[PDB]
């Protein structure tokens, strides 16, 4: 969803979802976007 939406909020009202009770494999996040900037400020994508 978070990426196969269309109406991503304007920045004045940033929509915020909560992700819980699930298993995260960020390869879907990778293949859902021809990335331009993946500057992580938390955990490295390798160890994500």
């Amino acid at each position: 969803e978070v990426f196969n939406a269309t109406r991503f909020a304007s920045v004045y009202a940033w929509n915020r979802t909560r992700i819980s009770n699930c298993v995260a494999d960020y390869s879907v996040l990778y293949n859902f976007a021809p990335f331009f900037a993946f500057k992580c400020y938390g955990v490295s994508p390798t160890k994500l």
Binding site: N31, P34, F35, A37, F38, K39
Partner: protein, 97 residues
Amino acid sequence: NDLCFTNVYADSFVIKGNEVSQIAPGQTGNIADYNYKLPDDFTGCVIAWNSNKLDSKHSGNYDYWYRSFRKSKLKPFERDISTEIYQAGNKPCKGKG
């Protein structure tokens, strides 16, 4: 102009304007991750000058190339010349589209 070097390596390539900002020891970006990666402990100089007179002509010129799809990151000073279609999902697909 006051130093000596065991050996000197000169790597030359044309990239775009933002990519000059991208080229630096350990930066993020499909160039600094899949196309060229300098070592973290880099001891050298990066030269960049504008060339709109040799890489441009009327009706366009698409001669140059760059990689956005690699199976992993690029190790420092390591070339990855190859034409292999990136896998998506689980298909052993070999082709465009």
